[PDB]
Design a protein around this ligand. Structure first.
Ligand SMILES: CCCCCCCC/C=C\CCCCCCCC(=O)O[C@@H](COC(=O)CCCCCCCCCCCCCCC)COP(=O)([O-])OCC[N+](C)(C)C
Ligand SMILES: CCCCCCCC/C=C\CCCCCCCC(=O)O[C@@H](COC(=O)CCCCCCCCCCCCCCC)COP(=O)([O-])OCC[N+](C)(C)C
Ligand SMILES: CCCCCCCCCCCCCCCCCCCC(=O)O[C@H](COC(=O)CCCCCCCCCCCCCC)COP(=O)(O)OCCN
Ligand SMILES: CCCCCCCCCCCCCCCCCCCC(=O)O[C@H](COC(=O)CCCCCCCCCCCCCC)COP(=O)(O)OCCN
Ligand SMILES: CCCCCCCCCCCCCCCCCCCC(=O)O[C@H](COC(=O)CCCCCCCCCCCCCC)COP(=O)(O)OCCN
Ligand SMILES: CCCCCCCC/C=C\CCCCCCCC(=O)OC[C@H](CO)OC(=O)CCCCCCCCCCCCCCC
Ligand SMILES: CCCCCCCC/C=C\CCCCCCCC(=O)OC[C@H](CO)OC(=O)CCCCCCCCCCCCCCC
Ligand SMILES: CCCCCCCC/C=C\CCCCCCCC(=O)OC[C@H](CO)OC(=O)CCCCCCCCCCCCCCC
Ligand SMILES: CC(C)CCC[C@@H](C)[C@H]1CC[C@H]2[C@@H]3CC=C4C[C@@H](OC(=O)CCC(=O)O)CC[C@]4(C)[C@H]3CC[C@]12C
Ligand SMILES: CC(C)CCC[C@@H](C)[C@H]1CC[C@H]2[C@@H]3CC=C4C[C@@H](OC(=O)CCC(=O)O)CC[C@]4(C)[C@H]3CC[C@]12C
Ligand SMILES: CC(C)CCC[C@@H](C)[C@H]1CC[C@H]2[C@@H]3CC=C4C[C@@H](OC(=O)CCC(=O)O)CC[C@]4(C)[C@H]3CC[C@]12C
Ligand SMILES: [Ca+2]
Ligand SMILES: [Ca+2]
Ligand SMILES: [Zn+2]
Ligand SMILES: [Zn+2]
Lengths: 665, 166, 665, 47
């Protein structure tokens, strides 16, 4: 039999001090007033009593929303501590104003009235509080090591983290940004960037910072949405302190802001400068004009080089024409590379005509690469992740040219490749040239972002590469373990290449042998076993060691099972789970990428294609006026969205009943 | 588990091992049935290792022979048939028993279809369905595992590493 | 400029006839009464006027729910047509009773007040209407070809279908089953079965019938849920007109009813008859007792056969012991079959000891099969879909025995198999025996339903077999097309087996040749190409017909692409989509299957394992009382669930305000 | 120390264990020697 009792006992009640609490709970004004005045005359009661549910007279008045009992209690000199915070958090303007005009608490001691107003995001009460000179502390830099920060973290770290989070949550309020801010858009950009940076440093508190950054981005997008004229749109997008604001938004990774329909329409208008009917055109005529502009790229380049100011001179300044010319030049370079492969008995031959034509394009590519790193900088150069492939290709081409010139200078004989050594400079140069051709042909993937059908697909594939890289580590660990074991088992029976039928050793021969004799060959065999290109008799020895053969076969079968049946199927499940979430924002990611690609062609520098490449207060006032108009529209819209819900409004009957009762009285 | 990027993945792989173990039973039953049938059919034509071209008997030789002569060899051949490392002429006899050869080929094809087209695809669907639900609590499971691993080093005992421990 | 006007013009209004409509809309009793009496005295108004929104005075009174204006209008002799239906459909009891006591319509002409009450499913109004002698028409049998049905469908088919659907929807009401039904559970079973059958016949109207059947099943399950004693539960499950109701529910496919926790607990209690602490036992001791009971199956069978009434005689009557004994007998038979494979130079040898022991088990299996078809019937025998495999295995065994006896009678020599013919009875018998062994070993899958971990998996695999069968048709069509094409192309260059290096023709040789010479070989090669067991040089000819070789290679590559890259990946997507929906009801399906398997062992017949097999108004009154109690509980619970929502009830202020105003007056 | 945490780990209270405050305290105890490990570069951490 479980003796149910009270373990933590509170104080007793049911005196006159509880009588007048329950009178206040009833709320009848006359009875409350008479009981309170009688108790005050008697001078034997207090006002510190607490109900079992955790509410007092003032808290119950807060919950019931009765201004008459509110003013009566406040004029009766009841306790006032935290009552302003409770009223602000209850979100009633009349009692907030009344309390402003004049133990156990569910409020953190660091909470300020302005902080709570910012947390609750109420425009009216926020303005009412901010009309007085109220301020907010500064949280220190992200990696501050100053004595004040180290000391405060040492005495109490949980309170410090909570205070920082509360300060940032109050600062990231859309209303508190609408007021007391000269540039709300820039403020939102910087705040979102700072919160995104803070999320990584504060590992335990990540979701809160991420949601604050998302809220800032959404506020910026909603503020942009209210523009209702092309003049206002261009003023906003061109304000600086062209398209400086758009460049800043691209830098700060504001994909929702960038992918706005109005901004995209303006960008398309700027992009299709030469053609004004490109929107209303047939696919056949678009294709025909595409070839007819791409075919005359050398003529256009020569015309611009000769006469920069002419009818044909300025025809290449348009971004679309420049993009078409660059694409045609790259396609011509790739065609030359393909034609190159279509006497081989000389040692270090002079370059042929195809290589002579290929060299100016390669030199131009390198020149264009260095200028962009000099103009952009190291961080911008490495952020693209395509410049890595560009640098690798250019370095490989430079090494190929150097090796070819070295071979030409050194060797001058005529000997067969069957007698040439394995480390010949000519052979090294051909291998590097083949790798360079592979990389250059693979470089064409970056042009898929300009298309409507392939951009999101390419963006989705790029996102999944990360999961591929993550699984590669586990696969490599398993492969290393099994290769170590197999080599340790099989390294005893190594045989020389002379004893083999065709003087061939390894797995790249018809007589596959010595598959696990060395660690490198074991790694190669275990890699090739995934695709089923390794035979089954490689796990055999010339001697009759049936136990050893069976153990090796068991190891091989276990590795095959683990690699193919379990790990490969698990990768597939991860790809599906990742792509399900990836497919949601494909449009936004593709539009951001296409905007970056489009703006990459707006600059005046580098107009020519690679082969020929080698050879101020009025604006502030206008922006302020437009920002004021947008803020007013946004405030109205968000007030309405707050009014969209709770459609079953009340107290209209109470107000009318009070009025008619007074008239009857 | 000590890393932020690999912990949930390892935890997810560990959770799926159970479904792997559950499917292994059905696969083993099917394999045992088909191996019993194939051995019962083919055990009549066993040949000695002397008559073989290289004195090699079994499936681990270039001349793959006697694949279904014994139950153990039948099990090994049916296991290796999943990865396509078993040839097609193993279902042949020196005599001209075309009916027996056709029946053996039909059994082999039925086993291949059942094992590869139906059971392997069904495992994949189960892995997706399990991982969908698994991915929800990956953070909680990884944090619990990392907390256990961290608290495994708080005790005073065993401070020294293994070579100096003895 | 789009001239917006009225295309379909109604009648004019705004006379006194509209004045008194808007007076009724206002609802002030005194003004409405005085206006109506003045208009009646004037004798110049009507009551047929209609508002632009499609409502009249009575309809607006229905919507506003004002009993005083209701009785005033009804006593003023307004039009009454369809008003009862509008009130019943508005679901207000006071005005329904008032209207019962005394053009354009949104109601189908076939709608009856009782039909609408059944559609709306209101217990109170349904009872109020049914207290009078009201009835419902009969819809005819599913495939009725009678003149009345053919004539009514000929004059108007849409109206006929609508009338049938409305009649069935009214009949399938849970409240209309609670009233006016002696056996609500049996009525719900039959109604659900009939609606499920109707869904297939009425192809256009499927979702409605399916949802009606689901509603009937849910009502039956909810009615069963209210049982609150073991006595009531067993009375319900044993009522007949043992476990007759459970057998009927299993026959009618009531998986939700069967999988109830109370029914499952009772079934488990009946199943674990011998062991009362089986729930609280260790896995090790459960396993130990499982082997210790399965090992003594022949001793237990012999003891039961000798002394049916003894301590050991009745130990096999328990269902769990019987199941264990049968499983052990089948495992022993499979072990004997395995041992069988472990002189071969004789023609038609006599059977060996292993076959002599195997024959009694095979004869017992056949005897047990025929008895079950004789006892069950053709439909029950073919519904299991395991009896098909049982029949195939038994027929194969019979054919093997017949062929063996024929060979023994006919052939008596000693000739080598290398000289035996290809159609030898001995070889045919061995092939049939191998196929029988495969089938018998595959029969063990059906025992997975008794386990908690494998049942849902087996059930899920069984559900997906249907999608496998559906995809097989498309695959077969593609294979037939490509095989026809390849054979037509390649049949010109057929070569004889003598010219081949090893006198081997076909794809089952080392020298793979004549892969597409015949249609059968083309089919076999295209089948084996899926697993990559067909080489690439089979698409070659001895002559130098490079064009023909290239065309054949192109056909082969196209077939490979279509079969492997497109069709195989599409099957996977279908399996995932099907399994997502399949995984929801796995528990219910597994519990239904396990209940069927458990009840398969409750009968007295066939107690012995296969080798030894060859050698009445008080109950009605109690059921009626229990059904009445369950109906009362269900009605209370569903009334409360109707009261669970709309928690913001009203008209309490209106009633109190009316009362205090009358007291003040 | 951390007897209640040990009991919670024994009783498989993963939600209780994965609380942000408990994780912060555990990280503080784990990174005893280095107090600026949170604010450090990947290169210097690796070094
Ligand atoms: C991403 C990272 C960057 C990737 C691109 C780097 C480009 C840089 C290229 C640098 C090329 C230098 C060549 C120097 C030759 C010197 C010589 O005589 O040969 C020596 C051996 O030389 C070799 O073994 C060269 C191997 C080159 C590997 C290139 C990998 C490209 C990967 C591509 C991407 C996958 C002779 O040695 P020995 O005398 O026998 O002793
Ligand atoms: C599901 C459906 C039912 C399936 C089980 C059916 C069982 C019934 C079995 C009936 C067996 C009859 C054998 C008769 C032999 C007669 C004889 O002399 O041989 C003749 C040929 O005989 C053949 O070609 C027999 C082929 C048997 C195929 C069995 C398929 C089993 C499929 C198992 C499932 C997959 C000689 O002919 P000839 O003189 O050369 O001219
Ligand atoms: C003896 C050696 C013989 C070697 C033989 C083979 C040589 C070639 C090896 C090639 C290996 C694969 C290379 C694939 C490159 C193309 C991949 C495109 C897929 C894709 O969308 O990736 C984008 C990045 O490209 C990338 O993935 C760029 C990666 C650059 C790697 C360069 C390596 C040299 C993502 O776009 P994004 O995320 O970059 O978008 C900007 C973000 N700011
Ligand atoms: C002639 C014979 C020749 C044989 C040749 C091959 C020999 C090696 C065979 C290796 C077979 C595979 C072994 C895989 C081990 C690593 C698996 C890691 C995957 C994983 O996350 O699993 C964890 C457990 O590890 C595990 O899965 C531990 C399993 C230990 C099995 C030991 C068998 C010996 C799950 O973590 P968790 O659930 O344990 O976490 C604590 C819960 N309290
Ligand atoms: C020269 C010829 C050489 C031939 C060599 C091969 C011979 C053997 C061929 C075997 C082919 C595959 C047979 C698979 C049988 C087991 C399948 C178990 C999977 C499963 O859950 O299916 C259950 C039915 O079993 C079934 O799928 C029963 C199918 C019976 C087919 C019998 C064919 C003979 C579903 O359970 P359920 O839906 O039946 O549950 C009761 C509903 N009322
Ligand atoms: C991290 C990931 C952890 C994954 C853990 C899984 C481990 C795999 C366990 C099964 C390994 C089976 C190896 C069998 C083997 O090497 O046999 C070759 C050897 C070759 O002589 O054969 C045998 O030793 C037995 C032949 C019969 C085997 C039948 C198949 C049993 C296993 C089926 C697994 C599913 C496919
Ligand atoms: C538990 C899981 C239960 C799964 C149930 C499924 C059963 C598989 C049924 C199909 C078996 C086909 C076997 C064919 C065979 O062995 O032929 C080889 C033999 C070799 O001589 O060839 C034939 O007998 C006919 C050759 C043409 C066959 C065309 C393909 C038909 C089946 C396609 C299935 C999908 C791939
Ligand atoms: C119902 C389902 C409808 C499916 C419709 C799809 C049709 C498949 C179309 C592609 C067929 C490609 C056949 C190529 C072929 O036979 O080449 C062999 C022959 C062998 O001589 O080679 C060629 O003719 C060209 C060799 C280069 C081909 C490169 C690959 C192009 C196609 C890739 C497809 C994806 C893999
Ligand atoms: C995977 C292939 C390339 C074989 C490599 C074998 C070893 C060199 C690897 C395998 C697993 C690795 C470990 C995996 C994870 C960790 C935890 C990691 O912990 C942290 O990073 C703690 C700091 C933090 O992330 O907050 C420190 C390195 C270490 C021990 C790694 C050290 C290097 C190991 C032993
Ligand atoms: C799968 C491979 C390794 C071949 C093994 C063949 C047989 C030895 C297996 C195949 C299916 C097995 C059966 C699958 C499921 C069950 C139900 C199982 O029932 C229970 O556990 C009841 C108690 C409970 O779980 O509440 C008893 C064992 C049995 C008959 C198993 C006995 C052993 C069987 C016949
Ligand atoms: C798929 C493999 C086995 C090759 C078989 C080739 C033909 C014999 C098949 C391929 C497509 C079949 C057709 C697919 C679908 C239909 C529609 C089908 O229409 C109905 O069933 C109408 C009645 C109804 O379902 O309400 C009549 C048979 C027909 C023409 C089939 C006739 C037989 C066809 C031509
Ligand atoms: Ca670049
Ligand atoms: Ca049966
Ligand atoms: Zn500081
Ligand atoms: Zn009829």
């Amino acid at each position: 039999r479980i003796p149910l009792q009270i373990v933590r006992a509170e104080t007793e009640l049911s005196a006159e001090e509880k009588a007048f609490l329950n009178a206040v709970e009833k709320g009848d004004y006359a009875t409350v007033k008479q009981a309170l005045q009688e108790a005050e005359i008697y001078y034997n009661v207090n006002i510190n009593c607490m109900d079992p549910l955790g509410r007092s007279a003032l808290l119950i008045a807060i919950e019931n929303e009765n201004l008459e009992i509110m003013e009566l209690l406040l004029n009766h000199s009841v306790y006032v501590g935290d009552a302003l915070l409770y009223a602000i958090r209850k979100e009633v303007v009349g009692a907030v104003e009344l309390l402003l005009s004049y133990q156990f608490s569910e409020f953190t001691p660091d909470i300020t009235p302005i902080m709570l107003a910012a947390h609750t995001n109420n425009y009216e009460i926020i303005k009412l509080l901010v009309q007085k000179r109220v301020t907010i502390p500064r949280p220190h830099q992200i990696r501050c090591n100053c004595v004040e920060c180290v000391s405060s973290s040492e005495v109490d770290s949980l309170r410090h983290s909570r205070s920082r989070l509360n300060i940032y949550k109050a600062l990231a309020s859309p209303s508190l940004i609408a007021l007391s801010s000269e540039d709300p858009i820039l403020t939102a950009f910087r705040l979102g960037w700072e919160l995104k940076e803070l999320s990584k440093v504060e590992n335990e508190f990540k979701a809160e910072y991420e949601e604050l950054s998302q809220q800032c981005k959404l506020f910026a997008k909603d503020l942009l949405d209210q523009a209702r004229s092309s003049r206002e749109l261009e003023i906003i997008l061109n304000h600086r302190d062209d398209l400086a604001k758009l460049k800043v938004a691209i830098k700060y990774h504001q994909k929702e802001f960038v992918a706005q329909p109005n901004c995209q329409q303006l960008l398309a208008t700027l992009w299709y400068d030469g053609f004004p009917g490109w929107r209303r055109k047939h696919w056949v005529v678009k294709l025909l004009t595409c070839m007819t502009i791409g075919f005359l790229f050398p003529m256009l380049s020569i015309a611009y080089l000769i006469s920069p100011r002419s009818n044909l001179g300025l025809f290449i300044k348009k971004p679309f024409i420049k993009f078409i010319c660059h694409t045609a030049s790259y396609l011509t370079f790739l065609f030359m590379l393909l034609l190159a492969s279509q006497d081989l008995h000389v040692q270090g031959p002079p370059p042929t005509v195809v290589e002579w034509m290929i060299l100016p394009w390669v030199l131009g590519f390198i020149w264009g690469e260095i200028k962009e790193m000099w103009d952009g900088g190291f961080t911008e150069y490495i952020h693209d992740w395509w410049n890595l492939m560009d640098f690798a290709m250019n370095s490989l081409y430079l090494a190929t040219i150097s090796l070819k010139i070295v071979a030409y200078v050194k060797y001058n004989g005529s000997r067969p490749r069957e007698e040439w050594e394995m480390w010949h400079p000519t052979l090294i140069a051909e291998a590097l040239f083949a790798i360079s051709n592979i990389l250059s042909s693979l470089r064409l993937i970056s042009l898929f972002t300009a298309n409507s059908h392939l951009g999101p697909l390419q963006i989705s594939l790029g996102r999944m590469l990360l999961d591929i890289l993550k699984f590669l580590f586990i696969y490599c660990l398993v492969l290393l373990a099994f290769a170590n074991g197999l080599n340790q088992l099989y390294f005893y029976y190594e045989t020389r290449a002379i004893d083999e039928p065709n003087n061939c050793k390894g797995i790249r021969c018809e007589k596959q042998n010595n598959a696990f004799s060395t660690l490198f060959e074991t790694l190669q065999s275990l890699f090739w076993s995934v695709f089923g290109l390794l035979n089954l008799y490689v796990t055999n020895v010339k001697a009759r060691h049936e136990f050893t053969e069976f153990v090796g076969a068991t190891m091989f079968g276990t590795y095959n099972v683990i690699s193919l049946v379990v790990l490969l199927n698990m990768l597939i499940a991860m790809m599906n789970n990742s792509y399900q979430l990836i497919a949601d924002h494909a449009d936004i990611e593709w539009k951001f990428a296409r905007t970056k690609l489009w703006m990459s062609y707006f600059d005046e520098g580098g107009t020519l294609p690679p082969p020929f490449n080698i050879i101020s207060l009025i604006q502030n006032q206008h922006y302020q006026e437009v920002i004021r108009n947008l803020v007013k529209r946004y405030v109205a819209a968000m007030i309405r969205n707050s009014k969209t819900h709770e459609g079953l409004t009340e107290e209209n009957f109470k107000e009318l009943k009070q009025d008619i009762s007074s008239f009857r009285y």
